[PDB]
Symmetry: C5
Subunit: 267 residues, 5 copies
Amino acid sequence: VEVLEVKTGVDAITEVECFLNPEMGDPDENLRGFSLKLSAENDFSSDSPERKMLPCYSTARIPLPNLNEDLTCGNLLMWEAVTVQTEVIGITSMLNLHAGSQKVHEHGGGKPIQGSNFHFFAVGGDPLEMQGVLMNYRTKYPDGTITPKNPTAQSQVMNTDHKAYLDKNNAYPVECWVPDPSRNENTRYFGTFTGGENVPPVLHVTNTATTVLLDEQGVGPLCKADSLYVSAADICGLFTNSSGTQQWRGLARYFKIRLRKRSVKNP
Amino acid sequence: VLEVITEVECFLNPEMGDPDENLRGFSLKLSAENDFSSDSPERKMLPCYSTARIPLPNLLMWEAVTVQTEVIGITSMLNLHAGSQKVHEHGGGKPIQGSNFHFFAVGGDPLEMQGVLMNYRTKYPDGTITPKNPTAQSQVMNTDHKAYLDKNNAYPVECWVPDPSRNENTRYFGTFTGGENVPPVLHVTNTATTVLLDEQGVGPLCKADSLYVSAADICGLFTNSSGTQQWRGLARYFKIRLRKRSV
Amino acid sequence: EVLEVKTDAITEVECFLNPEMGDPDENLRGFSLKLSAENDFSSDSPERKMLPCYSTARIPLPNLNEDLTCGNLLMWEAVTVQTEVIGITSMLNLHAGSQKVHEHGGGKPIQGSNFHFFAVGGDPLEMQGVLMNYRTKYPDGTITPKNPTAQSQVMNTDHKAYLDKNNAYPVECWVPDPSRNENTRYFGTFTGGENVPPVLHVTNTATTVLLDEQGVGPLCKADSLYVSAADICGLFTNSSGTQQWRGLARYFKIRLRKRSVKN
Amino acid sequence: VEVLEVKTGVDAITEVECFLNPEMGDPDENLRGFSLKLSAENDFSSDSPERKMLPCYSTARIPLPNLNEDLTCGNLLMWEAVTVQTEVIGITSMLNLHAGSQKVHEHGGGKPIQGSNFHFFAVGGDPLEMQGVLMNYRTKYPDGTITPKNPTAQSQVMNTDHKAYLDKNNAYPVECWVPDPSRNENTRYFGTFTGGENVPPVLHVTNTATTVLLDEQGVGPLCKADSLYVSAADICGLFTNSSGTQQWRGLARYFKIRLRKRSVK
Amino acid sequence: VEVLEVKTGITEVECFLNPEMGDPDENLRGFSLKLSAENDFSSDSPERKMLPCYSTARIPLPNLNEDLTCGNLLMWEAVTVQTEVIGITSMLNLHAGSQKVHEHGGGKPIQGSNFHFFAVGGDPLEMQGVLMNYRTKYPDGTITPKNPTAQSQVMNTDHKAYLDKNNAYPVECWVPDPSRNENTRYFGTFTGGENVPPVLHVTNTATTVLLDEQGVGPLCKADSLYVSAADICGLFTNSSGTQQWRGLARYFKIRLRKRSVKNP
Ligand SMILES: CC(=O)N[C@H]1[C@H]([C@H](O)[C@H](O)CO)O[C@@](O[C@H](CO)[C@@H](O)[C@@H]2O[C@@](O[C@H]3[C@@H](O)[C@@H](CO)O[C@@H](O[C@H]4[C@H](O)[C@@H](O)[C@H](O)O[C@@H]4CO)[C@@H]3O)(C(=O)O)C[C@H](O)[C@H]2NC(C)=O)(C(=O)O)C[C@@H]1O
Ligand SMILES: CC(=O)N[C@H]1[C@H]([C@H](O)[C@H](O)CO)O[C@@](O[C@H](CO)[C@@H](O)[C@@H]2O[C@@](O[C@@H]3[C@@H](O)[C@H](O)O[C@H](CO)[C@@H]3O)(C(=O)O)C[C@H](O)[C@H]2NC(C)=O)(C(=O)O)C[C@@H]1O
Ligand SMILES: CC(=O)N[C@H]1[C@H]([C@H](O)[C@H](O)CO)O[C@@](O[C@H](CO)[C@@H](O)[C@@H]2O[C@@](O)(C(=O)O)C[C@H](O)[C@H]2NC(C)=O)(C(=O)O)C[C@@H]1O
Ligand SMILES: CC(=O)N[C@H]1[C@H]([C@H](O)[C@H](O)CO)O[C@@](O[C@H](CO)[C@@H](O)[C@@H]2O[C@@](O)(C(=O)O)C[C@H](O)[C@H]2NC(C)=O)(C(=O)O)C[C@@H]1O
Ligand SMILES: [Cl-]
Ligand SMILES: [Cl-]
Ligand SMILES: [Cl-]
Ligand SMILES: [Cl-]
Ligand SMILES: [Cl-]
């Protein structure tokens, strides 16, 4: 994480950079970036996934410099996020087909990482607001996770009780929570889910792509309590061991966020 | 329609069949290989269109200008530990995949639909509303089969499509992707808006002070460890911006 | 010689055009006969009911000219078309007739090679013949390339036809002719393969403009508007393993205006 | 050639069109548009493809109305290619699943054409300039083909010695040659290769689509010696016979090119 | 460097950059060594000829300052690049070496995981290291992350490198660094999977603009322009079942202009 004053003064620009690590489960000291092997075929009535098998959303709050010397002014300044550049880091590591992965056929190379994937990021001036939805409301989630409380069969579709802030790193399982489109007034989020056994990962990198964060009125996320929030989930697919066991593989996400100062009325 | 703000929102639940009290959002397991002459699907096996009528506040009518919409809970498909058949010995569960249909509509009247059947001889179950007096021509275009989407969880998705020859006061959008191995591909973002205005700059007009939302979001098939398959669907969020229009 | 647009001057016409997939018996409207396979090129005699054909309709329009021997005339000009394939959700019936994907599983979706095509013009669609096998012996009731040779498997300019009869020109024999069709706009996509997924969109918010670079749409000769289509959605696989083409109807809504022309 | 203003007026525009047949190998008198059946698994040291097994680029020269080439004359113009309409002809012929092709399974229809494909066209005022690259530099190419001369292992990557003009129809194998991005100043070319066993052909037709041939300065190919050059390769995929043998299938390409007169000095 | 106006009063440079796939013997230029599989993470020692590496070249340019004493100096600025992968049709040879798709059939096409990447800059490309397996023992002649840890499988900021040697930095170890490369533009797409079809386009009508948001392209501060690439097209499957990477060369044509800058 670096917070850099690119330009100072009234028209100040600050660039915040950071690399957000993935939270795939990390089943031993050597397997950072992977999950525990996947179980299968648990009855819905006895579905108790292990903690280290569940990828969780990544998040961080980045403190920004205070802008207001006198808190009793009629107007106060706030950091406004204007643009974000982002990409997934280490995509070429998946070209290692010699380590650990099941041969595609006799005398062949290892099997590429492939299968269901989810790539998501958000940038806001408040914590990302999430809505809970479950495959199976009867899943018994493990200690260390934060999941929908008092779920019912309606939790498999839409149960408006399941509202959360993404307010803890490595705790909200990706399978339990989605960004909430009915809230998030002060966050922009973007995600794509691609499901299936043989889905190919397709990932682009370039330092020439920028996403504008301004809304229809030309206003970007406003950093409340001088806090910038970054969130991500980048499940790249499944790694298949020679035994046949499968593990999720994730990668870190880079953010470069440009901010300016906006004058707001003192509430 | 003469010269020219409020926001309404809704989470609309999917109607996949719901075969028991625990399997909300799924269908009954699929049967297969029924002869066309003896094809009698059970009600809980048949996903239906979802719809809701939203009342609005009382010369002037409410005009729908934009909609933001997305499918809710897409990441729930990353649960590969519960119920699904292993992809191979020692592997994880099989993802939901296969034929899917994602559709929504926003209008000032109920959605107008046209009936088309795979098999006109299908015997549809009590509780469903399906094309009446079907013939072989119902497998192609039979103009008899007109309906309003006027009841939730009643019009099977397999029997009905939005009618492009009507719906003057509704905008609708749908994509069907068929095949046993089709990957679900679903996007979420709060930065995307669909404009509902036509080429005259007029959106759906809510006569009777009612807004209609409609959807179908069949995500694919869930394959149980036994090999049986069930449709899985997800709720759809709508946020609709409306303005007052003189008429 | 096209003059100015006139401004009563607008009309809309609409039509649903049924597919012509072969219709092997009275129950199987919208399907073909089961597909044969592995016929030697020297003994390839497909049955009529196995061959999907192009659909077409001629729509008469109000007769605008009292006297065709005047210096100037009025003609109907097609300006836009809205079009949609009808009944796409019917493929969500996986309980009827189709082969199980595996033991205890649901039926196999319709999938595989498909072709989606439409045209709107003021003359019949003009077609060019090309054959997989020039030696195919086509059945009575079809209209296919006459006097075909090996060159008919590539480009043989002899094979020019008008789409002037419904349910007669096999899709496998004929394509729209890009060297003609001055007065028709056409659009088609072929996707081939064993397992290709159908992907079909519906919306009442999409309009195709038919005006050329000079701002002129198709002009309706003899006050007739022509619509044409082919919508082979894929193959249906029966429990036995046999396969049949499945097609669907196409809707057209066409806006026309009056255009002054010189005689 | 210094480029001046576009000229308009009487006879300052023309349109030419052509259908260019594919050159897939044509293994006998009945199998025009196909190749000979594919061999497989030849060691790189003993790889001797038969001529009839090798698809080649197609090309033709279209004469244009004669303009005076005398650089000192008082009305010096060249034809300039502005747009091209083009599509592959006969795509629906692949819906014949009754003739020749292996059944997909017992009682099923024939197997569709599918697999690796290449769709390419070029329009220019000179012959298309090509660069040679080989899968295997040791391939022994057959009489009647023009292939990279005296190749080395570097010819499997980039060997700048392998420069050729597409100056003969049905002679330059598609597998040996690509358009050269370091030349072709006076040609516009466009190609897509999609490889794989089960790749679906995807082909669009419409008479409403046009490709603009003007560069960033608004200048299209200028036709030297009043000749317009068209080139193509349209390998649609592999046809699988009942035996399991495979043959390339190709189709003709249509071109309609609009040209205008350009003043030059 | 303080950037002033464009000097008005433009050149082009070009390069074909060869791929560095491993080249296991004198006849298999453009391929890797056969791929091993199923090595335990604890005993993963890939041979050098099995590892594709990034390609790079430096293009020398003449200094523009006849007087090096002027208040304002001049530098070459890269404005646009035309680029293309060369020899894509060579994959239509299904008669040589590749495993038959089925009895009596043709050879198996090249397919599977692929990576297509290029960069143009006024400084060598700046890279960040990320590993599949931090315990991999890389072979002599490669340059790979130093003193890796488990964090090197996600993001370890210690692993910074310059692409300063051709055929040395394995593609599997390194990515362009989005936190640096102020003076380089880079573009890459990774597509992974066993049966992924190569999809490659060629046209001489496509240009990539290299100007940033302020209208300034990479500046050749030391009178040098750097081109970099990786074009792994997929896997070639031999008749025996063994697999090898196949790569192809990349062409670059770069338009340069003269840019006034303040003298340091
Ligand atoms: C559209 C079309 O015309 N398809 C036909 C193709 C096509 O003309 C060619 O592929 C174009 O190059 O030809 C087919 O030919 C087959 C042979 O492949 C027929 O000759 C077919 O052959 C049958 O006998 C074959 C088997 O014994 C086979 C087993 O491996 O060996 C073949 O001979 C080999 C030989 O052993 C080998 O040394 C040599 O290198 O290659 C030859 C093949 O070229 C035998 O020919 C068979 O398939 O069982 C006997 C059949 O009676 C005969 N059928 C006909 C109609 O002649 C083709 O499939 O490629 C036929 C296809 O219809
Ligand atoms: C996600 C989940 O919980 N999946 C279940 C799955 C699911 O509930 C159904 O598919 C929804 O339709 O059911 C699985 O078990 C089924 C139960 O239906 C099989 O055991 C199936 O049961 C048959 O008999 C049933 C009775 O068991 C049940 O109590 O009552 C109904 C009538 O209301 C039936 O009589 C049946 O459905 O016909 C007998 C049949 O042999 C069984 N089929 C197979 C292939 O074994 C399932 O589909 O596997 C269990 C899964 O965990
Ligand atoms: C990439 C990798 O580590 N693959 C190994 C996997 C993997 O560790 C787990 O599936 C993650 O949950 O484990 C495999 O099984 C072995 C037993 O053969 C595991 O118990 C692991 O054994 C170790 O000795 C090892 O390094 O392989 C120690 C390791 O800590 C164990 N893993 C855990 C989570 O405790 C498997 O096939 O699943 C072996 C595979 O190579
Ligand atoms: C949707 C539907 O109606 N499917 C039925 C099909 C279908 O009517 C035809 O394929 C259309 O041409 O027919 C199925 O039965 C056929 C009837 O033709 C078979 O029983 C075949 O009958 C024969 O009499 C024949 O030659 O047609 C003998 C032949 O051996 C039979 N073929 C097989 C593979 O058994 C069909 O499976 O095609 C029944 C299907 O429900
Ligand atoms: Cl909750
Ligand atoms: Cl009805
Ligand atoms: Cl004819
Ligand atoms: Cl040469
Ligand atoms: Cl390092």
